Design an enzyme around this catalytic site. Structure first.
Site, PDB file in Angstrom:
ATOM      1  N   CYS A  95       0.797  -1.227   0.000  1.00 18.93           N
ATOM      2  CA  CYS A  95       0.000   0.000   0.000  1.00 18.93           C
ATOM      3  C   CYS A  95       0.828   1.274   0.000  1.00 18.93           C
ATOM      4  CB  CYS A  95      -0.986   0.001   1.162  1.00 18.93           C
ATOM      5  SG  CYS A  95      -1.874   1.552   1.302  1.00 18.93           S
ATOM      6  N   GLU A 108      -4.667   3.656 -10.964  1.00 18.89           N
ATOM      7  CA  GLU A 108      -5.391   2.408 -10.736  1.00 18.89           C
ATOM      8  C   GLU A 108      -6.545   2.379 -11.768  1.00 18.89           C
ATOM      9  OE1 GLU A 108      -6.243   1.172  -6.673  1.00 18.89           O
ATOM     10  OE2 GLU A 108      -5.816   3.289  -6.194  1.00 18.89           O
ATOM     11  N   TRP A 114      -9.418   6.127  -0.973  1.00 17.33           N
ATOM     12  CA  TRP A 114      -9.684   6.782  -2.248  1.00 17.33           C
ATOM     13  C   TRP A 114      -8.671   6.239  -3.250  1.00 17.33           C
ATOM     14  CZ3 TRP A 114      -8.663   9.973   2.236  1.00 17.33           C
ATOM     15  CH2 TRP A 114      -7.352  10.397   2.352  1.00 17.33           C
ATOM     16  N   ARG A 166      -0.067   4.698   2.763  1.00 17.25           N
ATOM     17  CA  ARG A 166       0.104   4.536   4.223  1.00 17.25           C
ATOM     18  C   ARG A 166       0.431   5.759   5.007  1.00 17.25           C
ATOM     19  NH1 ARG A 166       3.812  -0.470   4.652  1.00 17.25           N
ATOM     20  NH2 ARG A 166       4.375  -0.144   2.415  1.00 17.25           N
TER      21      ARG A 166
HETATM   22  C1  HEM Z   1      -6.402   6.758   1.675  1.00 14.85           C
HETATM   23  C2  HEM Z   1      -6.013   6.459   0.422  1.00 14.85           C
HETATM   24  C3  HEM Z   1      -5.381   5.173  -0.024  1.00 14.85           C
HETATM   25  C4  HEM Z   1      -4.706   5.026  -1.197  1.00 14.85           C
HETATM   26  C5  HEM Z   1      -4.572   6.123  -2.232  1.00 14.85           C
HETATM   27  C6  HEM Z   1      -4.244   3.677  -1.281  1.00 14.85           C
HETATM   28  C7  HEM Z   1      -3.550   3.215  -2.369  1.00 14.85           C
HETATM   29  C8  HEM Z   1      -3.316   1.881  -2.598  1.00 14.85           C
HETATM   30  C9  HEM Z   1      -2.930   1.368  -3.840  1.00 14.85           C
HETATM   31  C10 HEM Z   1      -2.785   2.133  -5.125  1.00 14.85           C
HETATM   32  C11 HEM Z   1      -2.806   0.059  -3.732  1.00 14.85           C
HETATM   33  C12 HEM Z   1      -2.451  -0.907  -4.840  1.00 14.85           C
HETATM   34  C13 HEM Z   1      -3.778  -1.480  -5.369  1.00 14.85           C
HETATM   35  C14 HEM Z   1      -3.757  -2.256  -6.682  1.00 14.85           C
HETATM   36  O1  HEM Z   1      -2.856  -2.134  -7.555  1.00 14.85           O
HETATM   37  O2  HEM Z   1      -4.685  -3.069  -6.892  1.00 14.85           O
HETATM   38  C15 HEM Z   1      -3.082  -0.240  -2.373  1.00 14.85           C
HETATM   39  C16 HEM Z   1      -2.949  -1.514  -1.860  1.00 14.85           C
HETATM   40  C17 HEM Z   1      -3.429  -1.711  -0.565  1.00 14.85           C
HETATM   41  N1  HEM Z   1      -3.843  -0.786   0.366  1.00 14.85           N
HETATM   42 FE1  HEM Z   1      -4.084   1.073   0.149  1.00 14.85          FE
HETATM   43  N2  HEM Z   1      -4.457   3.053  -0.147  1.00 14.85           N
HETATM   44  C18 HEM Z   1      -5.265   3.833   0.616  1.00 14.85           C
HETATM   45  C19 HEM Z   1      -5.852   3.499   1.847  1.00 14.85           C
HETATM   46  C20 HEM Z   1      -5.894   2.188   2.343  1.00 14.85           C
HETATM   47  C21 HEM Z   1      -6.644   1.749   3.461  1.00 14.85           C
HETATM   48  C22 HEM Z   1      -7.621   2.568   4.278  1.00 14.85           C
HETATM   49  C23 HEM Z   1      -6.370   0.423   3.643  1.00 14.85           C
HETATM   50  C24 HEM Z   1      -6.860  -0.504   4.678  1.00 14.85           C
HETATM   51  C25 HEM Z   1      -7.423  -0.052   5.775  1.00 14.85           C
HETATM   52  C26 HEM Z   1      -5.435   0.080   2.646  1.00 14.85           C
HETATM   53  C27 HEM Z   1      -4.944  -1.168   2.494  1.00 14.85           C
HETATM   54  C28 HEM Z   1      -4.324  -1.559   1.331  1.00 14.85           C
HETATM   55  C29 HEM Z   1      -4.017  -2.975   1.134  1.00 14.85           C
HETATM   56  C30 HEM Z   1      -4.278  -4.165   2.075  1.00 14.85           C
HETATM   57  C31 HEM Z   1      -3.438  -3.081  -0.065  1.00 14.85           C
HETATM   58  C32 HEM Z   1      -2.925  -4.399  -0.710  1.00 14.85           C
HETATM   59  C33 HEM Z   1      -3.920  -5.191  -1.598  1.00 14.85           C
HETATM   60  C34 HEM Z   1      -3.309  -6.473  -2.162  1.00 14.85           C
HETATM   61  O3  HEM Z   1      -2.243  -6.922  -1.668  1.00 14.85           O
HETATM   62  O4  HEM Z   1      -3.907  -7.104  -3.097  1.00 14.85           O
HETATM   63  N3  HEM Z   1      -5.099   1.195   1.921  1.00 14.85           N
HETATM   64  N4  HEM Z   1      -3.232   0.919  -1.629  1.00 14.85           N
HETATM   65  N1  H44 Z   2      -8.003 -13.284  -7.866  1.00 10.28           N
HETATM   66  C1  H44 Z   2      -7.114 -13.684  -7.068  1.00 10.28           C
HETATM   67  N2  H44 Z   2      -6.114 -12.872  -6.649  1.00 10.28           N
HETATM   68  C2  H44 Z   2      -6.015 -11.504  -6.760  1.00 10.28           C
HETATM   69  C3  H44 Z   2      -5.067 -10.859  -5.944  1.00 10.28           C
HETATM   70  C4  H44 Z   2      -4.919  -9.466  -5.957  1.00 10.28           C
HETATM   71  C5  H44 Z   2      -5.727  -8.671  -6.775  1.00 10.28           C
HETATM   72  C6  H44 Z   2      -5.600  -7.145  -6.781  1.00 10.28           C
HETATM   73  C7  H44 Z   2      -6.301  -6.556  -5.528  1.00 10.28           C
HETATM   74  N3  H44 Z   2      -6.384  -5.115  -5.509  1.00 10.28           N
HETATM   75  C8  H44 Z   2      -7.605  -4.293  -5.388  1.00 10.28           C
HETATM   76  C9  H44 Z   2      -7.291  -3.099  -4.534  1.00 10.28           C
HETATM   77  C10 H44 Z   2      -6.735  -3.434  -3.327  1.00 10.28           C
HETATM   78  C11 H44 Z   2      -6.325  -2.447  -2.463  1.00 10.28           C
HETATM   79  C12 H44 Z   2      -6.466  -1.100  -2.792  1.00 10.28           C
HETATM   80  C13 H44 Z   2      -7.024  -0.734  -4.005  1.00 10.28           C
HETATM   81  N4  H44 Z   2      -7.267   0.588  -4.275  1.00 10.28           N
HETATM   82  C14 H44 Z   2      -7.463   1.554  -3.388  1.00 10.28           C
HETATM   83  N5  H44 Z   2      -7.085   2.802  -3.543  1.00 10.28           N
HETATM   84  C15 H44 Z   2      -8.082   1.239  -2.078  1.00 10.28           C
HETATM   85  C16 H44 Z   2      -8.974   0.246  -1.777  1.00 10.28           C
HETATM   86  C17 H44 Z   2      -9.284   0.358  -0.454  1.00 10.28           C
HETATM   87  C18 H44 Z   2      -8.682   1.395   0.250  1.00 10.28           C
HETATM   88  S1  H44 Z   2      -7.632   2.263  -0.750  1.00 10.28           S
HETATM   89  C19 H44 Z   2      -7.450  -1.758  -4.878  1.00 10.28           C
HETATM   90  C20 H44 Z   2      -6.684  -9.302  -7.579  1.00 10.28           C
HETATM   91  C21 H44 Z   2      -6.830 -10.697  -7.576  1.00 10.28           C
HETATM   92  C22 H44 Z   2      -7.239 -15.084  -6.502  1.00 10.28           C
HETATM   93  C23 H44 Z   2      -7.723 -15.573  -5.274  1.00 10.28           C
HETATM   94  C24 H44 Z   2      -7.656 -16.977  -5.158  1.00 10.28           C
HETATM   95  C25 H44 Z   2      -7.128 -17.602  -6.288  1.00 10.28           C
HETATM   96  S2  H44 Z   2      -6.719 -16.425  -7.485  1.00 10.28           S
END
Ligand code: HEM
Ligand code: H44
Ligand code: HEM
Ligand code: H44
Ligand code: H4B
Ligand code: H4B
Ligand code: ZN
EC number: 1.14.13.39
Lengths: 405, 405
Positions: B109, B286, B281, B112
Site C-alpha cells: 500500500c 489504478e 480513495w 500509508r
Molecule cells: C487513503 C487512500 C489510499 C490510497 C490512495 C491507497 C492506495 C493503494 C494502492 C494504489 C494500492 C495498490 C492497489 C492495486 O494495484 O490493486 C493499495 C494496496 C493496498 N492498500 Fe491502500 N491506499 C489507501 C488506503 C488504504 C486503506 C484505508 C487500507 C486498509 C485499511 C489500505 C490497504 C491496502 C491494502 C491491504 C493493499 C494491498 C492489496 C493487495 O495486496 O492485493 N489502503 N493501496
Molecule cells: N483473484 C485472485 N487474486 C487476486 C489478488 C490481488 C488482486 C488485486 C487486488 N487489488 C484491489 C485493490 C486493493 C487495495 C487497494 C485498491 N485501491 C485503493 N485505492 C483502495 C482500496 C481500499 C482502500 S484504498 C485496490 C486481484 C486478484 C485469486 C484468489 C484466489 C485464487 S486467485
C-alpha cells in the site's frame, strides 16, 4: 502440483513451473523472513575444480556428448591442469559457449532473445595496455558497423594467481564527462564524476562541455593504468531531434550509439575474466527515460516541459509524464533517421516474452529480475509487467566486481 | 545481518531493523527470489496464545502503558479465555488499534501516510446477511461523504472453529458486471465475469451495458449468500472527460468514486476477520492505466489512439504511451471537476517517501513491495523507483483468503 516455483502470467492466465532454478548453486540475497529483490547490489583447489566440472558438463551437454569419451578426457585434463598449476584454461569453443551462456544467464537483461548471436573476440593473448586499446578499437569498429550494430564481447586474460588483473577502469567504453562546478552542480553526466576526476588525475586534459567523450583508462597486470583517447571518428553519436517539435533539435542533445559495458567480471567454470567488455544496442528508454530524465542524471524533464509549455507547478498536469514520452520519441526518431540500431520498450518486452517461452521449453525456466526487466516508463503497458518472474544466479555469469582503485 | 537500504537518487542509506519483528515467512529462499509473485504459494492454543500476547503487548505499548496493572490483567483475561475456550475476543479499542496497524503494515500500500486516519466501524454484533447490508450501506454513505472521501473499515464477526465464515463474496463493494459472450469475448469488466455469473445464478436480473453496477452477495455463516442491490444513490460515479480533447467524453467512460476492498482477511492477535471491508480513495493510475488500459480489463488504448489519430501500426510511435497519458489525465480532470477525492501517482509516491522516513524514525523500518509501490506508468519519474525497499510480513495484517464458492 510440482515442487518448483509456480510462475503465473496474469494477462493471459497461463502457469509454468520453473525447474531450472534447481541448478542454481549460488545463493541470492532473500530469505523466508524477508525479500531483498529490489536492492541493486546487496553484499581453492577443489572449489575451482567442482565449478570447472560443472561447467565442462554444461559444455558437453550443449554439444550433446555428455558421458562421452571426449567428455571424460576433458574432465581429466582439467583436473590435471589444476592438479599441477592451481588453475586451468578454456578451449576456444568453451569460451564462446560460456560467454553466450553468461549472457543467457543474466537475470537483469531484457535483450536475451538475441543471446545466441554474439561475436566473441578471444583476446586472451593480450600482454599490454596498448594492445588492450587496439583490441577495444577493433571491438568498437566491428560492433558499431556504421549504425548496424552487432553484439560482441572481447575477452582479455583471465585472473591468474599472484599477477595483477587486466582491468578497464571506465564503466562503459563510451561515457560523457561529468565536471563538478564551483557551486556544486555538475556539467555533463553526474554518473561519471568519479571516472572523470580519475582521468584528470592520470593526466587527461579536461574539456568543458556537456557531452565530452572520456578517454579510457586501461590497466595491464601490475602496472598503473594508462590513458587512451578514442579517435573521434570511432565514436558514433546521434544528435537528438523530435519528429514534430521543431525546437527539440535546438536543445543540442545527443547520445552515443554503442552501449558497451566494461567493468563487469565474466565468470566461467570458476575462471575469472576481469576485463571482458561487451556491447549490443540500446533500448530506447535507457537513454530517453533514465539517462536524460533521472534527476541525478541529465535531469532534462523540466526544460523540455517548459518548452512544451506545460504546467510544471502542479503534479496533476502530468507534465513529467508528457515530456518523458516526447523525449523517448525523440530518441527513437533520431536513431531511426540516423540508421543506428535501437529498440523500443514495447518491441523489447514482447521479444523477451518470446525468450521466456523458448527457455521454458529448452531449460525449464529463465532467471529474471522483474524490477529491471519492466521498463521505467509505461510499465503495465508492456506484457512483462503482467508476468511473474523467478530470480536466481546461474553460472556462467556476469558479476559486479570492486572498482580497481 | 540486517538489510542496508539505499536510495540511488539521493545516495542516502538506512538499515531496516523492523524486519527482525517478522514471525511469518514470505515466498523467497536463498536459492530463488519470488517477490514478483502476486499470491502466496501455500495459498493450537499455544500458538494463538503467543500471537495474542504479542498483540496485547503492541497495544499497551502504543498507549504508553506497558507493565501497568491494566496490561497484566488483560493478558490474564486473554489467557483465561484461550485456555478455557480455544479463542478470545478483542475490546473495541484493541480492534481500532489493530485495524490501523494492519494498514500500516501492508507492504503493497502506497497510501500509508494516511494510516492513522481510519474510521473503524465495529459490526461484530452482526447476525444475518440482512444486517451485514445495513452496515455496508452505512459504511458507503460515511466513506463517500458526497465526494470528500474518508478512509473506513467495517469489521464483521471473527472466524469461529465451529462454523462457517461471514463473507462478502464480491471482491469490492462496487464492481461493474462482465458478461461473457458466446464467442468467448467480454462486455464490461472482464475481471468480474465469475462474480457476475454467480450473481445471475443466485437470481440477479442482469443488464447489458459496460458499466452495470453489481448487487452484493453476502453470506452469514453456513447459509447460502443473499443478493442485495445497492441503492443507486449510494454509488457515486464520475463520468470521464478530457480537458482539451472534446471527443473523449463521447467514449462514454465512467468510474466509481469509492474503492472498497471486501474479500481480504484481517488478522489481529491471531484472530481472523473474514469480512472486514475497507475503503479509502483512488490513486489515478489504478483507473487510468490498469482498469481502463490493461489488455485483460477494458482495454481502451487502441480506441483512444484511433481517436487521437496516432500511428497504431508500429510500436515505435509510442502511441500506447501517448494514449495512456491522456487517459490518466482525463481521470484526474474528471475527478477534480466532480469534486471527488483522488490522488495522482506523483503526489502519492512523494507522500510515501515521507511515510518511509516517518517510519524509519518510529519503528526502524517499513515493509514495502517495490513492484506494487512503483506505479504502472512513469515509474522512474517517481522517487519510489530509486528507493530500495524490504518486503516482509508483520502482524496485524490484511491477507488473502480463498474464494468462498
Ligand atoms: C487513503 C487512500 C489510499 C490510497 C490512495 C491507497 C492506495 C493503494 C494502492 C494504489 C494500492 C495498490 C492497489 C492495486 O494495484 O490493486 C493499495 C494496496 C493496498 N492498500 Fe491502500 N491506499 C489507501 C488506503 C488504504 C486503506 C484505508 C487500507 C486498509 C485499511 C489500505 C490497504 C491496502 C491494502 C491491504 C493493499 C494491498 C492489496 C493487495 O495486496 O492485493 N489502503 N493501496
Ligand atoms: N483473484 C485472485 N487474486 C487476486 C489478488 C490481488 C488482486 C488485486 C487486488 N487489488 C484491489 C485493490 C486493493 C487495495 C487497494 C485498491 N485501491 C485503493 N485505492 C483502495 C482500496 C481500499 C482502500 S484504498 C485496490 C486481484 C486478484 C485469486 C484468489 C484466489 C485464487 S486467485
Ligand atoms: C542485443 C541488444 C541488447 C539489449 C537491447 C539489451 C538490453 C538490456 C537492458 C535495457 C539492460 C538494463 C540496463 C540498465 O538499466 O542499466 C540490460 C542489462 C544487461 N544485459 Fe543486456 N541487452 C542486450 C545485449 C546484451 C549483451 C550482448 C550482453 C552480454 C554479452 C548483455 C548483458 C547484460 C547484463 C550482464 C546486464 C545487467 C547489468 C547489471 O546488472 O548491472 N546484454 N540489457
Ligand atoms: N553506481 C554504482 N553501481 C552501479 C551498479 C550497476 C549499475 C547498472 C549498470 N548498467 C549499465 C548497463 C549495463 C548493461 C546493459 C546496458 N545497456 C545495454 N543496452 C547494453 C550494454 C551492453 C550490451 S547491451 C547498460 C549502475 C551503477 C555504485 C555502487 C557503489 C559505489 S558506485
Ligand atoms: C531500487 C531499484 O532497484 C533501482 O532503482 C532499479 C529499479 N529497476 C531498474 N531497472 C533497470 N533496468 N535499471 C536500473 O538501474 C534499475 N534501477
Ligand atoms: C507480476 C506482477 O507482480 C504483477 O503484474 C503486479 C505488479 N505490480 C503491481 N502493482 C500494483 N500496485 N498492483 C498490481 O496489481 C500489480 N501487479
Ligand atoms: Zn525475494
Amino acid at each position: 502440483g510440482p515442487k518448483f516455483p509456480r510462475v503465473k502470467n496474469w494477462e493471459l492466465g497461463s502457469i509454468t513451473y520453473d525447474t531450472l532454478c534447481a541448478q542454481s548453486q549460488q545463493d541470492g540475497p532473500c530469505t523466508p523472513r524477508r525479500c531483498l529483490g529490489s536492492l541493486v547490489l546487496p553484499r581453492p583447489a577443489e572449489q575451482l575444480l567442482s565449478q570447472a566440472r560443472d561447467f565442462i558438463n554444461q559444455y558437453y551437454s550443449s554439444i550433446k556428448r555428455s558421458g562421452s569419451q571426449a567428455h571424460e578426457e576433458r574432465l581429466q585434463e582439467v583436473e590435471a591442469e589444476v592438479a599441477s598449476t592451481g588453475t586451468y584454461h578454456l578451449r576456444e569453443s568453451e569460451l564462446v559457449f560460456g560467454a553466450k551462456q553468461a549472457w543467457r544467464n543474466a537475470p537483469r537483461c531484457v535483450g536475451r532473445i538475441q543471446w545466441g548471436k554474439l561475436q566473441v573476440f578471444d583476446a586472451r593473448d593480450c600482454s599490454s595496455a596498448q594492445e588492450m586499446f587496439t583490441y577495444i578499437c577493433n571491438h568498437i569498429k566491428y560492433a558499431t558497423n556504421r549504425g548496424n550494430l552487432r553484439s560482441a564481447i572481447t575477452v582479455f586474460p583471465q585472473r591468474a594467481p599472484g599477477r595483477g588483473d587486466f582491468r578497464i577502469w571506465n564503466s562503459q567504453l563510451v561515457r560523457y564527462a561529468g565536471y563538478r562546478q564551483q557551486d556544486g552542480s555538475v556539467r555533463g553526466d553526474p554518473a561519471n564524476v568519479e571516472i572523470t576526476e580519475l582521468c584528470i588525475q592520470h593526466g587527461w586534459t579536461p574539456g568543458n562541455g556537456r557531452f565530452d567523450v572520456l578517454p579510457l583508462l586501461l590497466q595491464a597486470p601490475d602496472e598503473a593504468p594508462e590513458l587512451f583517447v578514442l579517435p573521434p571518428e570511432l565514436v558514433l553519436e546521434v544528435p537528438l531531434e523530435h519528429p514534430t517539435l521543431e525546437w527539440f533539435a535546438a536543445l543540442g542533445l545527443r547520445w552515443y550509439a554503442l552501449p558497451a559495458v566494461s567493468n563487469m567480471l565474466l565468470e566461467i567454470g570458476g575462471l575469472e575474466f576481469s576485463a571482458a567488455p561487451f556491447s549490443g544496442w540500446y533500448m530506447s528508454t535507457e537513454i530517453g527515460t533514465r539517462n536524460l530524465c533521472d534527476p541525478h542524471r541529465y535531469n532534462i524533464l523540466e526544460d523540455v516541459a517548459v518548452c512544451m509549455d506545460l504546467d510544471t507547478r502542479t503534479t496533476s498536469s502530468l507534465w513529467k509524464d508528457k515530456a518523458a514520452v516526447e523525449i523517448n520519441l525523440a530518441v527513437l526518431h533520431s536513431f531511426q533517421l540516423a540508421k543506428v540500431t535501437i529498440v523500443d520498450h514495447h518491441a523489447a518486452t514482447v521479444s523477451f516474452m518470446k525468450h521466456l517461452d523458448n527457455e521454458q521449453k529448452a531449460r525449464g525456466g529463465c532467471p529474471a529480475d522483474w524490477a529491471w526487466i519492466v521498463p521505467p516508463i509505461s510499465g503495465s503497458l508492456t506484457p512483462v509487467f503482467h508476468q511473474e518472474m523467478v530470480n536466481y544466479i546461474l553460472s556462467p555469469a556476469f558479476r559486479y566486481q570492486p572498482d580497481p582503485w
